[PDB]
Amino acid sequence: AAKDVKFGNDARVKMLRGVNVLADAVKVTLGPKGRNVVLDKSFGAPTITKDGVSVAREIELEDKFENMGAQMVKEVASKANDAAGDGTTTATVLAQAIITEGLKAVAAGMNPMDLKRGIDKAVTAAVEELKALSVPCSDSKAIAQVGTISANSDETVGKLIAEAMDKVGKEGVITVEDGTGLQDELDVVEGMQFDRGYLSPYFINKPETGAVELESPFILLADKKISNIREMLPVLEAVAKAGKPLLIIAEDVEGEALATLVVNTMRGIVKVAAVKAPGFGDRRKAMLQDIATLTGGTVISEEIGMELEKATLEDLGQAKRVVINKDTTTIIDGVGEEAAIQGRVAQIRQQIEEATSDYDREKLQERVAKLAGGVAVIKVGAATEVEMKEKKARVEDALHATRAAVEEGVVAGGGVALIRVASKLADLRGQNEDQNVGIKVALRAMEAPLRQIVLNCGEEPSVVANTVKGGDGNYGYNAATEEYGNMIDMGILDPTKVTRSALQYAASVAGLMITTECMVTDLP
């Protein structure tokens, strides 16, 4: 109800204090020689971490304005992590640097809109420079390298990912799951992956991984949107009498049907999962038909007049293993005769060699590649289950890093890429002097992360940063080995996607917070 409002300088200093608290909490973990942050818990034993994601997630402030500034920086950093796969700490420290310098400039009478324009211009130029500086990652040796360093120097993971990419291409679908035995086995199965997640986060069966995983699931393929239950309860009865888990693939699920499916899942009577149909229009129907052919079943389509009252087990699609994430889901080893897949991919082939519109042409290439590519699953083996799960986590992180590197490229890690780009962009200027001030602010901001890494390493950062700027190319300073040289040769590297996303979101949040005039929050 009643709310307290702050204007101008007071709001800016409140946000500055909140962001400073968050960044001082999260940035001590930056770099190989990162400090430890103790997160006291009510359970009884405090947890000790060196990763910035947990510290950022665990921090809140009693003062409302500082708090909300902290959570806005936190949400942009979380967006950076979700997009790139890492870089939360670098994004947060960059955001703090830009925010501090920009607010200091604004207090000097500068025009905040011009500062935001200059920061955005400098960041766009920096992204272009990073794209120029990125080393392409296409050779299997490069895949092995990124998988190795990304997984704490696990070269075996490097190979595993290398032949996985060799078998299913750079853009193919790859997943990792638990495997029996000691050796690590690689296998490719007929499957695909579309960019649709669960409709509600209450369908999750694995809170540790945050993925809706079903073993030998039995899916529903319906073109019409699902609102009520009476039309779809025969499916639940059939899966209950068959004892198999249930999954839903429809255009959109809404109404009390979602609530009752969640309730049934929680009660444990039968597992139910729902995933949106990818695309829209008739393309969604076409790809749903492709999915039905892949899984050997048929789709509940209203256009052909049939309905869901008569849907049964024998005339419905089934799968071997499905992993549903927040944004996308993977179908693994769709059960069905290969002849149907061959016929469908052939039909899509004629769809190419008589396609007219270019956009639909690329869409057909992507659809046929997704349908005929298949899915590769890698099973991790070990002595006991605990190190097996640890290697699972390491393999997942390495796979995300490899995907980012393939998508964008590889640049020098440890903040060397940012400082090199800032050095190369020393002569950038804007329309106004305030724009030039903003550009200088952005340059110092990209300088900041390497300084923080060196300070964590225990060395004074001014001389190290100056020495790194003096060099060219990928030459930089290694915090682990306390020496300079080529950063790529030493192996410490990060995907270009991570650095680019961190800089982009740091600039975005800093520009948002600089131009803020008013602050509205609940009255304490």
Curated annotation (Swiss-Prot):
It catalyses: ATP + H2O + a folded polypeptide = ADP + phosphate + an unfolded polypeptide. It comes from the Bacteria. The keyword Kinase does not apply. SUPFAM superfamilies: GroEL apical domain-like, GroEL equatorial domain-like, GroEL-intermediate domain like. Its EC number is 5.6.1.7. Its main location: cytoplasm. It is an enzyme of class 5 (isomerase). During the substrate-folding cycle, the two GroEL rings separate for effective substrate binding and chaperonin activity. Ring separation is triggered by ATP binding to the trans ring of the asymmetric GroEL:GroES complex and avoids formation of functionally impaired symmetric GroEL:GroES2 complexes. Activity of the GroEL-GroES chaperonin complex requires Mg-ATP. UMPylation of the chaperone by SelO/YdiU negatively regulates its activity, and may facilitate survival under stress conditions. GO terms for biological process: chaperone cofactor-dependent protein refolding; protein folding; protein refolding; response to heat; response to radiation; virion assembly. GO terms for cellular component: cytosol; GroEL-GroES complex; membrane. It holds the Pfam family Cpn60_TCP1. This is Chaperonin GroEL.
